[PDB]
Every structure is written in C-alpha cells, then in structure tokens.
C-alpha cells in the first residue's frame, strides 16, 4: 500500500514549497528511514534525502527534510528551474520491504496559470453502427498541466471503462490531455446525458452532451 | 554502473528473464534491488536481495510471480518473471541499496540502470479503425482512430494541405491493449459545407492507409 504524497505542487522561482508523505506508524512513523527521490522526463531518479534528515555529497542545500508522526515532509528553499520534475519518497516497513510514495510532480513556474479548453464529442454515428460507442473528452491549454478527470452519467458517477491520457506538452508551452468513455450503444441511448468534468488546480470545468 | 536486459514485449502468461551486469564496485558485499515504472505513473518497488543471496523480500503485487535472484561469481541480479499479467508492463531497473561500515544497507538507493522495458499485452499487430468526429464563429471537428496496434501512426489532414489549428492528442492504451488517439482541427464556421476536411491516418507496422471524409 503507497504512501499517500499530493498528486502536485507548484511554484514560482525563489519561492519555497513542500510536499508530504504521510504513511503508517508500520513504516513512516516507525523508522528514521524516509529518503526521498527526484526524477527529470526519462531519467532514472536520484536521492536527494536520506535519513530523513541527511544530504548526499553533491545535493543543494536548498533540500531539507522533517518528520512529524506518520508524515514526513520534503522541503525545497528557493525553486529554481532545475528543481522540477516528479519526486517520490521511499519507506522501510515493519517487514523490511520497501515502499513509494505515490509521487509528486513539481512544476517550478515559466507562466503565469492558465485554465483547460474542454471539448466533448458524442459518439460518432459510424461507430454506432458498428455496435461501439466511445466518448472523447479533450482538454487543451492549461498549466501546470495536471488534471483530475471525472465522468458522469446523468448527476452519477462512472468509473467503468474510463481511460485517460498524461498530460502531454503543446508547442504552445501549455498542456493537453484526453479521457475517453466506452459504452455499449445501449447505454448511451438509454441515460439522459453524459458529463466531463475536469478539476484543475482546485477548479472545476464541465461540458455535456445527450443523444 | 549497472545494465538491464533480458526485456521485451511478451503475452500475458509468457515468462521473461532479466539480467543487470554490475561493476565498477564490489557486487556480493551489497544489497540490491528491482523496481519498476509503469508509463505515465510512479515508481513502484519490486523485489530486495540481502548481498548474499540469503534472503529475498517481494512486494504484494508482484508475489509471488517474480522472484529475485543473483550470482556472486557472475556479479549479477537476476529477475525471474512468471504468469506475466498486463499490470506488469512498465520499466524495470536495477538499483544498488547504499551501504558501508558500522555492508550495513543506509536504506537510500544511490545507482540506477537505465532501465529495461516490459510490455506485456494481448494485442496483435492490427489496423486502426478510423471514425469522424463531427463539429456542432469557431468550429472544432477532428477523427477518432480507435483500436491500433503498436505505436505510431501519423495523421495529416487534407493531405498536408491544412496544417492550421490541428492538435493531434496522445493515444491512450486501452485494458483491451489496443491504442486509441484523437485529432483535432479548430475551423472557421463558415468554412463547413465549403470546404472538404480529409484526415489521413497512416499506419507503418500494419501498412494500412485510411482516409475519412468529416462532415457536420
């Protein structure tokens, strides 16, 4: 079972942020050996925390780490560009295995914050006719990019047969990202209306589409 | 420096075994690790190795499945994959547990291997099958290429000609293991019913070449 870090943070340059790790008293509040790891696109991660407290030779000391209870916490002074990127924090447990936060993407500002363009397509007519139908849910132009997205059949949840992309990179210097919905033609006749609703950076935006 | 190999793509119940070559340090005096990194999500531990081999610690997931294992006398970590599912898709690299005097495991991963890939799915190669996406004074429209198998396929529209306002998505993987990627062009609403809007989908592995007329 991960430990539980926030899906993100963000910053702009100069400015001090922090991120949480917050385990079981099994294996975060039960031991001193918290570490914590940086990872750049397509690179492989590197310490920047151990012991809880401790540098590795060669680590800025803008990088500091604390424990209080079950949550330990990561904290980087002065965000410079080069800080950013995803980190993850690994555990020792009661049982001498080893355990990962679930991870933190960390965007250290370029622009200002910008909100996503979302576009809903109802299931093409092509498809329906081939015993298919799928929705597309496009969202473009927003930053950080980090997006929950969600689904609603009528005002009721979905969470059956969902897939949505990683947020990609536009030549725009903003994201883009996309959550498609299967269902039977069935399904998509019998309900009154289909929802998207992506929620970023606290907001919540929302398109709908009906037979 | 450490090296991953022994990957590749493989059906879900196949086996595969991967191998990390070390060097550059004493092997059989360290602890080491296996982890791996599903695309597009978190890192993920998998199995530990005590440096001589007399004890081994697996992860939930992965138990009891993959079974670590290593060779003092080769300097090599070894993983060993059995009834392989589609979860275990995802990068495996081979990380070194620091360590030394009063070894002593510190508890922090200082060496990574630059990873090796495992792609476990049931898809065949396959052509895509293409849909339009209809629009509804600023028009969106675009295709739906669903069910493509593997990556890439490149889509133009109009041939090349109109390359203004087209935004091509990332595919998503679907739990069947086919690919499916959207298109789209932002058009002048005037346009529509005067203009012709052609997307052209091209898919090198398979050789299929498809093209679909949109329209309101």
């Known amino acids: 079972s991960a430990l539980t870090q926030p899906a993100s943070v963000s910053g702009s340059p100069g400015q001090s942020i922090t991120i949480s790790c917050q385990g079981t008293?099994?294996?975060?509040?039960?031991?001193?050996?918290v570490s914590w790891y940086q990872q750049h696109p397509g690179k492989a991660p590197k310490v920047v925390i151990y012991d809880v407290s401790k540098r590795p030779s060669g680590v800025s000391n803008r990088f500091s780490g604390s424990k209080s209870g079950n949550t330990a916490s990561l904290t980087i002074s002065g965000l410079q560009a080069e800080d950013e990127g995803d980190y993850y924090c690994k555990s020792l447990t009661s049982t001498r295995r080893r355990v990962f936060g679930t991870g933190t993407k960390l965007t250290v500002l370029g622009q200002p914050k910008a909100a996503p363009s979302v576009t809903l397509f109802p299931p093409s007519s092509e498809e329906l006719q081939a015993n298919k139908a799928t929705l597309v849910c496009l969202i473009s132009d927003f930053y950080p990019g980090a997006v929950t997205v969600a689904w609603k059949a009528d005002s009721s949840p979905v969470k059956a047969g969902v897939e949505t992309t990683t947020p990609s990179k536009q030549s725009n210097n903003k994201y883009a990202a996309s959550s498609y919905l299967s269902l039977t033609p069935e399904q998509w006749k019998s309900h009154k209306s289909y929802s998207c609703q992506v929620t970023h950076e606290g907001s919540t935006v929302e398109k709908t589409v009906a037979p | 420096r450490l090296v991953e190999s022994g990957g590749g793509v493989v059906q879900p119940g196949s086996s595969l075994r991967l191998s990390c070559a070390a060097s550059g340090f004493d092997f059989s005096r360290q602890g080491m690790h296996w982890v791996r990194q599903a695309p597009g999500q978190g890192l993920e531990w998998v199995a530990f190795?005590?440096?001589?081999?007399?004890?081994?610690y697996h992860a939930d997931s992965v138990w009891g499945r993959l079974s670590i294992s290593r060779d003092n006398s080769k300097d090599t970590l070894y993983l060993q994959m059995n009834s392989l599912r589609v979860e275990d898709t995802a990068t495996y690299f081979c990380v070194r547990e620091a360590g030394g005097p009063d070894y002593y495991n510190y508890h922090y991963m200082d060496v990574w291997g630059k990873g090796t890939t495992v792609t476990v799915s049931s898809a065949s190669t396959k052509g895509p099958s293409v849909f339009p996406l209809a629009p509804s004074g600023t028009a969106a429209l675009g295709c739906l290429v669903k069910d493509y198998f593997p990556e890439p396929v490149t889509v133009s529209w109009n041939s090349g000609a109109l390359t203004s306002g087209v935004h091509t998505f990332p595919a998503v993987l679907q739990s069947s293991g086919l690919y499916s990627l959207s298109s789209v062009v932002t058009v002048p609403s005037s346009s529509l019913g005067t203009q012709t809007y052609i997307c052209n989908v091209n898919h090198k592995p398979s050789n299929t070449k498809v093209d679909k007329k949109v329209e309101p």
């Open positions: 190795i005590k440096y001589d081999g007399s004890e081994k």
């Open positions: 008293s099994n294996d975060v509040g039960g031991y001193e050996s």
